[PDB]
Amino acid sequence: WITRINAAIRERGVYYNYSKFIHDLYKRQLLLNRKILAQIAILNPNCIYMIYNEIIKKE
Amino acid sequence: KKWYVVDATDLILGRMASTIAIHIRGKNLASYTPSVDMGAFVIVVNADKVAVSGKKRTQKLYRRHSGRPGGLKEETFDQLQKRIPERIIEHAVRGMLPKGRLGRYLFNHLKVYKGAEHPHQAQQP
RNA sequence: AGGGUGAAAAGAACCCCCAUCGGGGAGUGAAAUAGAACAUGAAACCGUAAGCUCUCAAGCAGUGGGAGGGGGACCAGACC
RNA sequence: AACCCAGAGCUAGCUGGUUCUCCCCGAAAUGCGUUGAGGCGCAGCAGUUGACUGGACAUCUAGGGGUAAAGCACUGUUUCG
RNA sequence: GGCCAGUGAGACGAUGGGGGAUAAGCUUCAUCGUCGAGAGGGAAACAGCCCGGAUCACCAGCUAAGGCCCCUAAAUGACCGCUCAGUGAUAAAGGAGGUAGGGGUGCAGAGACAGCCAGGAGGUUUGCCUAGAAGCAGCCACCCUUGAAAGAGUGCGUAAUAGCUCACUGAUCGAGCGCUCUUGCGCCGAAGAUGAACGGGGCUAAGCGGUCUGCCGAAGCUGUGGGAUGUAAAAAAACAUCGGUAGGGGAGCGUUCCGUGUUAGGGAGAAACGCGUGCGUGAGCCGCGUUGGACGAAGCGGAAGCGAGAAUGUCGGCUUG
RNA sequence: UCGGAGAGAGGCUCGGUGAAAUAGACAUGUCUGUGAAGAUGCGGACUACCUGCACCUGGACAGAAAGACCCUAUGAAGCU
RNA sequence: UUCACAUCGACGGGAAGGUUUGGCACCUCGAUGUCGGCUCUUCGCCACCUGGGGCUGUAGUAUGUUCCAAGGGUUGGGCUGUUCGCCCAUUAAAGCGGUACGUGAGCUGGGUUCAGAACGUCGUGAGACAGUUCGGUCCAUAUCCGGUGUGGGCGUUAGAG
RNA sequence: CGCUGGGUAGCCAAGUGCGGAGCGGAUAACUGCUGAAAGCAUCUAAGUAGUAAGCCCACCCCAAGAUGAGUGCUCUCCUA
Numbered sequence: 001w002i003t004r005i006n007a008a009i010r011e012r013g014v015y016y017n018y019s020k021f022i023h024d025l026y027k028r029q030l031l032l033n034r035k036i037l038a039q040i041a042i043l044n045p046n047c048i049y050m051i052y053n054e055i056i057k058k059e
Numbered sequence: 060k061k062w063y064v065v066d067a068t069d070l071i072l073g074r075m076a077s078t079i080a081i082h083i084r085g086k087n088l089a090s091y092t093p094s095v096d097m098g099a100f101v102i103v104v105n106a107d108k109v110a111v112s113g114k115k116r117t118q119k120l121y122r123r124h125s126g127r128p129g130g131l132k133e134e135t136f137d138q139l140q141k142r143i144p145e146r147i148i149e150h151a152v153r154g155m156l157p158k159g160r161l162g163r164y165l166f167n168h169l170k171v172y173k174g175a176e177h178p179h180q181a182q183q184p
Numbered sequence: 185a186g187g188g189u190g191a192a193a194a195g196a197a198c199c200c201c202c203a204u205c206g207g208g209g210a211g212u213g214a215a216a217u218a219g220a221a222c223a224u225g226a227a228a229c230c231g232u233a234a235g236c237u238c239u240c241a242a243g244c245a246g247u248g249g250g251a252g253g254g255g256g257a258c259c260a261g262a263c264c
Numbered sequence: 265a266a267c268c269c270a271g272a273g274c275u276a277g278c279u280g281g282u283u284c285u286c287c288c289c290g291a292a293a294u295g296c297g298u299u300g301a302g303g304c305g306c307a308g309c310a311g312u313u314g315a316c317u318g319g320a321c322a323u324c325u326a327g328g329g330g331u332a333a334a335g336c337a338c339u340g341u342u343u344c345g
Numbered sequence: 346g347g348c349c350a351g352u353g354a355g356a357c358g359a360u361g362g363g364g365g366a367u368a369a370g371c372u373u374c375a376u377c378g379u380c381g382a383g384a385g386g387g388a389a390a391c392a393g394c395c396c397g398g399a400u401c402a403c404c405a406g407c408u409a410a411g412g413c414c415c416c417u418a419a420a421u422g423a424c425c426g427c428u429c430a431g432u433g434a435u436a437a438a439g440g441a442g443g444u445a446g447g448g449g450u451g452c453a454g455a456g457a458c459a460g461c462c463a464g465g466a467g468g469u470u471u472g473c474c475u476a477g478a479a480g481c482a483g484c485c486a487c488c489c490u491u492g493a494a495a496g497a498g499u500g501c502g503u504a505a506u507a508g509c510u511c512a513c514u515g516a517u518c519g520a521g522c523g524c525u526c527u528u529g530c531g532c533c534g535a536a537g538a539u540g541a542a543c544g545g546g547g548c549u550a551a552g553c554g555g556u557c558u559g560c561c562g563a564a565g566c567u568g569u570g571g572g573a574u575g576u577a578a579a580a581a582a583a584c585a586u587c588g589g590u591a592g593g594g595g596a597g598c599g600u601u602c603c604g605u606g607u608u609a610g611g612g613a614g615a616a617a618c619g620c621g622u623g624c625g626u627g628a629g630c631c632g633c634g635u636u637g638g639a640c641g642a643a644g645c646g647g648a649a650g651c652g653a654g655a656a657u658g659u660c661g662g663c664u665u666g
Numbered sequence: 667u668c669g670g671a672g673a674g675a676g677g678c679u680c681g682g683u684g685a686a687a688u689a690g691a692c693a694u695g696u697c698u699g700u701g702a703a704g705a706u707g708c709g710g711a712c713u714a715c716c717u718g719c720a721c722c723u724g725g726a727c728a729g730a731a732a733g734a735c736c737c738u739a740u741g742a743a744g745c746u
Numbered sequence: 747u748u749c750a751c752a753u754c755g756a757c758g759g760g761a762a763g764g765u766u767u768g769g770c771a772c773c774u775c776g777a778u779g780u781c782g783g784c785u786c787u788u789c790g791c792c793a794c795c796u797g798g799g800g801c802u803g804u805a806g807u808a809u810g811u812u813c814c815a816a817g818g819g820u821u822g823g824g825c826u827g828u829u830c831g832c833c834c835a836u837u838a839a840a841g842c843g844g845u846a847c848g849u850g851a852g853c854u855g856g857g858u859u860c861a862g863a864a865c866g867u868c869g870u871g872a873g874a875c876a877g878u879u880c881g882g883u884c885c886a887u888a889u890c891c892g893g894u895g896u897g898g899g900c901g902u903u904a905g906a907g
Numbered sequence: 908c909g910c911u912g913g914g915u916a917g918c919c920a921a922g923u924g925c926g927g928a929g930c931g932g933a934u935a936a937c938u939g940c941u942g943a944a945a946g947c948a949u950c951u952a953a954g955u956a957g958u959a960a961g962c963c964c965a966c967c968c969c970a971a972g973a974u975g976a977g978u979g980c981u982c983u984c985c986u987a
Contacts, residue, residue: 020560076414126696126714135962150546
């Protein structure tokens, strides 16, 4: 799961870590989008693109 | 897949090998299959005038043995840039490639050549 | 060391190949994919045929994830 | 100082092996003796069964033995003046 | 207190002491923990070190130790500073203004230090010793004079002198210089055996030191379900235990035979092999196809010569070189 | 001391007959390090197409031999 | 001579390496054959000779010490079972050490803990003694790993020379 | 081969012939110049020049089975 996202992080913009990403949802209030639900990267990458703009707004 | 071109001149070497070994594997794309090969076919153009940032350029290491009684044939970094400057970046990314027989395929997807050129104008660089 | 084909042997004429060793048929019997090595006859071992994997890949090598391929599915539904 | 049979399947605190399954708890390799120390007996430690506000951690009160440290009047050593 | 045990040559790490050179995973005692009778995570690979100590399933989260460039998941994240050794990935006494930070002291435009120019005298050729030694083998003495300065005196040198240089002082240029103390990171001293005392690549940074945040990360923990043992209340809530050798204790399956059976199942048919991979905690059971040829046997109990892949086993058959 | 050549019986190839010591299982490379501390099978790394024949023959603490050496067990067998 | 360090260097000290002498005796007495010689080597280093250099109480020719470097090379005999060592005669010099003191699944097996026998010594004796002496059977057509060489196929892709 | 003697081809030797080199790139020890910090001085800290039989290369054999399986020349096949 971590590797799946890792390969998806080296393209967006948050070249930092996916940890801060998880931190965003944590500090936010999203108990969803788990390591297993990370399948949004491969298929329908349009949904995983939304959270990308929601993590920055929070932190 | 696609093909990308990168210039290796100011690069201090090594720091690039870890940034290129990810493209020839798909560690940057949707790599959802560690058992299957994928990624971009990024290749170096120069890799001959590549930097090093350090005094190791004249006393690095680079050792190999042919199993012969003598062997031990050791060479300094300064020699690599003198002879067969094409294996100065290859051998570098090789140790960065996972597995042994599978990761080898990812190695055949990277060319360095001399520099300022490349016989790959038919793959849309 | 070495047990019992079948109820009774009718335990195999004749025919074909071979050196008138051996076998296959024709017949007998409910059965010889029971016939003198013979009942039911597994395993170790030794082969043929079929599907898959198999030359740039190594370490008691299975296991977890897992593509493709030869078949079997359900009037998709993604499985054996 | 035999061959064969018989008591002797002699003896063998030696060594090796010791063939279905689940549940619960759980050792020791120390002491005291042993011509005894690769052996065991008793006790300690383990399991089972039948009786007992019996114990353990922590706080407080209430003593001694006197290591470390220090000292070194005394015992045994010790340089300068 | 009673029944059945097992085990008495254990090992290692930390700590406190005897033996040995306070040399050994060496040996002999005490104490704690681990291994030994519990995995796993981490130290590359090392049972005994560290974390945590496994009823089970689960493409479920959060953590410990250890880490976060790639190779195996995870910060070439932020701020300040040093090292620039690749030291960090072995190694001492000792040696060197390699170097950062803090404090203090001596000389110093009545002008110091480096450099340049010049002087560096006389008695004492000193005494003693010696073949000789007149700064300069050695011993003793080491005061005095003339001056701006010059010690009967450092190193070289001669058979003995001579000669050169130095201590000291003046002039010139001319500005701060030199030497210690406390403290951090480093250099040389480190050469031995088929190439590798960072896991590899690689690296001056993903080094180290100080501060802060997040994450990777164990059958740990949390969460849900299933199985097993034990305990009162009670609208309500369920807590906790389950690694395991030798051993102890508590429950069962299956095999041959017998009693209950010439009842019932079978020639519309045991046995040998497959399959349904359903079922039980498990060894297995049930049903069934094929082959095959005869009986076997449901349930409880009773009586057993009660199921071994190893005892250089035994018998027979069959591979390999 | 530098041995060479040649003639025979084997060795090599083919035809016929036709063994053994031994062996838990194999898809049983090297090296450094590590490991009850001189393993190919651990870890890292390097090297390396799959499979025979002939020969040389170090490794697998190879094979045969529960060693005749030492010690242990108040064993045994002879002798003085 | 003088002068401490050309060379050497007392009283003492700090380390490296590791082949000596020991301890340990951790893994092997259901065993891994001891030494030496012979045959054939491999690696490292504080290499003796050849080469490149500093100092030298180094004039030269020749030496002493130290640093880098081993690329290579590095002896025939008398006596003994001996490594070693001694001796005679050379070479530029005629090295050390590890590799279970290289090497017996190769030879040699001369020495030495197998049975015989004899002298000296010890015990009354049987015997014994890290004293000496004579004689005294140690096998094997090897699969694999690892080598010296040479083939059978296939893959490099249209098939071959 | 009974003994003994000589000898062609080939095979070997005490036979014959030849290479172990020089010349380069880059260095160890050391010798260097100019010139810093420590306005002197000093091999550098910054810039350069010499330097052994070591290393690389030069000579020789193998060598794209170095499957990152190259390069160059030439030849054969266009029936449904």
